[PDB]
Amino acid sequence: CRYIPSLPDRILDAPEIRNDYYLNLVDWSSGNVLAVALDNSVYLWSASSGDILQLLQMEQPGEYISSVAWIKEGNYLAVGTSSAEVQLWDVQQQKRLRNMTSHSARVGSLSWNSYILSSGSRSGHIHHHDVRVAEHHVATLSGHSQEVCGLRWAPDGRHLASGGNDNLVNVWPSAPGEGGWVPLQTFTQHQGAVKAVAWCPWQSNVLATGGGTSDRHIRIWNVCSGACLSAVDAHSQVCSILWSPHYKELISGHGFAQNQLVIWKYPTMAKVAELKGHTSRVLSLTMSPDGATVASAAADETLRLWRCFELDP
Ligand SMILES: Cc1ncc([N+](=O)[O-])n1CCOC(=O)N[C@@H](Nc1ncccn1)C(Cl)(Cl)Cl
Numbered sequence: 001c002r003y004i005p006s007l008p009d010r011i012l013d014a015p016e017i018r019n020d021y022y023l024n025l026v027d028w029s030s031g032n033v034l035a036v037a038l039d040n041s042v043y044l045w046s047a048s049s050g051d052i053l054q055l056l057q058m059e060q061p062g063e064y065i066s067s068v069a070w071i072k073e074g075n076y077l078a079v080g081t082s083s084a085e086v087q088l089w090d091v092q093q094q095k096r097l098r099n100m101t102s103h104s105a106r107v108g109s110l111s112w113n114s115y116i117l118s119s120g121s122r123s124g125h126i127h128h129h130d131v132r133v134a135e136h137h138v139a140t141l142s143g144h145s146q147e148v149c150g151l152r153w154a155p156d157g158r159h160l161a162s163g164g165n166d167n168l169v170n171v172w173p174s175a176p177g178e179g180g181w182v183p184l185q186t187f188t189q190h191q192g193a194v195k196a197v198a199w200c201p202w203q204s205n206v207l208a209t210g211g212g213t214s215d216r217h218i219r220i221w222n223v224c225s226g227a228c229l230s231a232v233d234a235h236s237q238v239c240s241i242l243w244s245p246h247y248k249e250l251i252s253g254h255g256f257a258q259n260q261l262v263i264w265k266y267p268t269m270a271k272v273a274e275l276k277g278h279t280s281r282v283l284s285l286t287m288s289p290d291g292a293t294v295a296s297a298a299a300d301e302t303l304r305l306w307r308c309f310e311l312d313p
Contacts, residue, residue: 002247003312004263004273008304009293012045014038019299021195021212021239021283022122022149022165023108024067026297028286031074033091034295036303037065042079044091047288055089056096069110069117078117080107086119088131102127102137109151111160113174118160120148126162126172143170143183150197156204159184159223163194169209171223185226191215196241196252200266210238210252218252218264232269234262240285242294244309251308253296255281261296263308275306 016039017025025037034045040058042065045051058064058081067080076097079087086107088098109120116138117129124146128139143162150163160172169187187209196210196218206229207221218238220230236254243250249272250264259282261275280299287294292310297303 001312004308005306006273006275008275008277009307010305012036012303012305014297014301014303017283017297017299017301018064019280019283021193021281022147024069024110024149024284025065026284026286026295026303027068027070028288028295029070029074029077030072030289032289033070033074034286034303035068035070035077036297037068037079040064042068042077053091053094055091055094056087066106066108067110067119069112071112072114078110078112078119080110080119082106084121086110086117086129088117098131098136100129100131100136102129105147109148109162111151111153113153113157113160118151118153120151120162122147124148124164124166126151126160139176139181141170141172141181143172143186144168149193149195150209152197152199154199154204155201158204159199159207161197161199161207161209161223163197163209165193167192167194167211167215169194169197169207169221171207171221185221185223187219187221187226187228189219189228189231190217192237196238198241198243198250201243201245202248208241208243208250210234210241212239213237213255218250218269220267220269230267230269232264236260237281239282242285242287244287244291246291246309246311249309251285251294253282253285259298259300261285261294261306261308273308275308277304278302
């Protein structure tokens with residue numbers, strides 16, 4: 001008896017959230033803490049206590065936060081900046097550990113693979129940071145000519161997927177191979193910015209991507225064969241995608257005109273539900289530790305938490 005609430009369970013106010021499609025401003029940690037980048041500050045919200053901590057604020061004018069990403073075990077937070085910095089923060093003692101520089105432009109995307117932090121920049125380059133050592137910059141992946149707005153390591157760490165405003169999807173190897181730091185695959189089918197990038201948690205080599213306003217499609221790939229398994233028209237820009245193993249489904253966030261979230265059944269790609277409420281385009285989606293709740297951040301300066309994947313007794 002699958003009951004999906006058509007409304008959110010809770011709404012958080014996100015004043016001054018930056019309405020920039022290419023930034024990745026929210027992330028839900030394994031310890032149940034949402035990190036939210038509001039203009040030039042990062043706020044942490046405990047989903048357990050409802051408590052808020054202002055972790056940091058930029059000190060120079062013009063500066064703003066361009067990305068946030070939790071480390072796997074949820075005690076450290078990576079923060080990308082418009083000044084091309086990748087900062088590492090210890091949230092427990094509430095102090096900055098590192099201010100890693102190496103990029104030439106704002107860092108809009110982040111993704112952890114254990115002790116390796118990968119960062120995407122407006123410049124088009126991707127950097128691997130070994131956050132444990134002095135010379136953190138240990139690699140450079142260059143396969144985009146525009147901003148890297150999507151960046152995601154596979155759960156098993158065997159691939160890194162990147163999506164850009166140059167309409168390309170690149171699948172990179174976990175380490176340099178017979179070709180060095182060159183993509184294993186490059187997909188060109190999308191005709192718009194690819195910010196949505198998510199790996200299937202129960203299928204190692206399966207990747208889902210989503211295109212922007214001029215594409216409007218969700219595409220499923222097998223990154224070994226390099227085949228497109230499916231191309232579904234969503235009739236709206238696709239900003240993020242998340243998988244749920246609870247019922248084996250996908251959820252995507254969208255913009256004009258409905259600004260809705262859509263739940264799809266996998267692998268049929270049948271439309272299961274539409275979640276309406278946001279009054280401006282959705283920007284990002286993040287998932288709670290237990291997988292039951294999805295947080296959607298939108299240009300309407302709210303964060304809507306949807307209990308859409310709960311396993312009811
Ligand atoms: C310091 C503070 N306490 C509540 C709010 N506020 O404006 O709501 N502020 C301003 C900073 O902004 C947020 O802290 N936004 C938060 N939203 C929120 N909304 C209602 C209840 C608790 N938190 C998150 Cl998005 Cl969770 Cl970080």
